[PDB]
Amino acid sequence: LQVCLPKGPTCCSRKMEEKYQLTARLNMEQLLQSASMELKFLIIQNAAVFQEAFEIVVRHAKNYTNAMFKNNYPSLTPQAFEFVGEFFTDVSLYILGSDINVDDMVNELFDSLFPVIYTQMMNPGLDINECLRGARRDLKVFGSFPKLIMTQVSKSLQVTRIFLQALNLGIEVINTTDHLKFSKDCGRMLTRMWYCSYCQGLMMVKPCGGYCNVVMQGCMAGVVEIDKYWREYILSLEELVNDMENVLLGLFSTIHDSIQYVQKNGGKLTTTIGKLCTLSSRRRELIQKLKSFINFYSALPGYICSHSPVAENDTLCWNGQELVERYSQEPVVSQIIDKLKHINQLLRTMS
């Protein structure tokens, strides 16, 4: 035998030892999955809900902008629907992490908005379109409104994007926890602690609490080091929640006021151009539920021993090799810590 230390005879061969080793691996993985399932499902639920809620907010804001265009500026439709749809499509694509430039969103929005304003509201009566698009920025017809919207929406969209990516990376690392492959020596120690008692002919004897403690603190020396970074992740997420609904919903008022502002100087503009051419509640409940799992990595070996059959009294128990009266007494982890450091820096820089 290569795992079961043979003190007397033995009721099991080498192949039965391999079977016990595979069952030990699977039992450890199942225990880790059972430990991590509640937190995994919490973060998965919240990620899905926040994603759908942000999409609902973006759709409602696009709808509100379209409705106020229909109501206040019917002369700008249906072209208004095209650029509003493109703007909010790029909004959602940015929220979901795609490479979108916010300044470019706002600038293309006003570039498309100005020519229809000039042709339908100021000078009623397609080839000259690009001259108007250039004059929009060259004459600063919209004043400070484009930069106001630019900062207003970039500030909220960046924090929302990083919030979603933080939730997804938490899901990723919690998924990594239950798939942690361990050393061969730990495989043999778990086989001895859980099954090698059966090879000596014992039926209901459980391993000693202290033996479970030494084994678990033996193979979880690396996993426990993640606890500092996981705690910093929780606290940085709390730092970030303490924003995007109000901005996207006031966008219509800001655009209407910008259109008024441009119409205010129509006299000079027409002549010059004619010559020239419950969310906050949810994230609060999420942070308050996430703080209940701040001890997850530090309490993990305690969980494995308290949910495995063990003799807590350390009396008449299995010590890995014999029945005693009293007990005597990185690469994947590195990737988890790397991603936690990255997301923690990204969190801390926002707030």
């Binding site: 192949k15 595979l22 690469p331």
Partner: protein, 54 residues
Amino acid sequence: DTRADHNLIIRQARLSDSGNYTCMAANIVAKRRSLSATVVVYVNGGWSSWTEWS
């Protein structure tokens, strides 16, 4: 170093010289040996700086 996707990476041919490297898969069913790769480390010839004229 051993990779998760079963690859043997050698950075320098100094700390791990030539040999017949063989990959072997172990399972609860049995073991299987792959075809051994003959990895030979070669040193290219390098002349010398000229001496002085006799």
